[PDB]
Swiss-Prot record, chains A, B:
CDD domains documented for this protein: PaaI_thioesterase
PANTHER family according to UniProt: 1,4-DIHYDROXY-2-NAPHTHOYL-COA THIOESTERASE 1
UniProt xrefs under InterPro entries: HotDog_dom_sf, PAAI_dom, Thioestr_dom
Name the record gives this protein: Putative esterase PA1618
Single annotated GO MF: 1,4-dihydroxy-2-naphthoyl-CoA thioesterase activity
Record-level GO cellular component terms: cytosol
Enzyme class name: hydrolase
Gene3D superfamilies documented for this protein: Hotdog Thioesterase
């Protein structure tokens, strides 16, 4: 209901083929009227050299999730969306399991979208918070 | 000379084994007295679904580079460094070639480090700018 295109998790996941989301094991898991959820493994694909989840990989999950959320909110026959600005606080380290990100809208303007993205490990504790600004660009 | 540990590009690259840097093809390329440089391919490993460099992958390169820069600046027998906050402006899209990131220090404090990280594609034009805040934590 936030959504223009009704999210279809199969197509969301399928669309990742031959892109970093596929390579890192990102999976779109759920959605409702006001949020979209995706997760990613915490393993050697996403670790930094000390064996913790790479802070950048948290940002890949957040930008994948928010970029897809924007795509489901715009008129795709006339517009596409690109990342404009992203920021994140790294709150807790993760070593294994999966990290789950939930995106909610802060503002869907005509020319920019701002997304609130909350990540947590399998213990449910906040691990990262991101805010993503997307630009809406005419095709 | 910014550096405590003299950067050794072979060991920097070798240390990425079984981590996301290895998976994405990140390579530490150069250093001097005040900067450290690494690059990453722009291909299917790092694209988003529309065939452009994923904004998150830019952030992986930036955080890999800055995290390593911090590691070379602290007393590693007593401290380690973790990402605390990261932000980036996505300036231009890239489709192919490599993206090159250069890290310079803004502030190396006792408990935090702040890094300025500039990325550009092979045409030399700015593609992303990031600023990274690292926490210095006692072992």
């Amino acid at each position: 209901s936030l959504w223009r295109q009704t999210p279809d998790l199969e197509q969301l996941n399928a669309s990742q083929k031959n892109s970093i989301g596929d390579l890192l094991g990102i999976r779109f898991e759920a959605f409702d009227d006001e949020s979209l959820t995706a997760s990613m493994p915490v393993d050697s694909r996403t670790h930094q050299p000390f064996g913790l989840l790479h802070g950048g990989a948290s940002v890949v999950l957040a930008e994948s999730l928010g970029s897809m959320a924007s795509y489901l909110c715009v008129d795709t026959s006339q517009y596409y969306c690109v990342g404009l600005e992203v920021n994140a606080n790294h709150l807790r380290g993760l070593r294994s399991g999966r990290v789950t990100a939930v995106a909610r809208a802060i503002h869907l303007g005509r020319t920019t979208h701002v997304w609130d993205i909350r990540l947590s490990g399998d213990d449910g504790k906040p691990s990262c918070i991101a805010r993503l600004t997307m630009a809406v660009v005419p095709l």
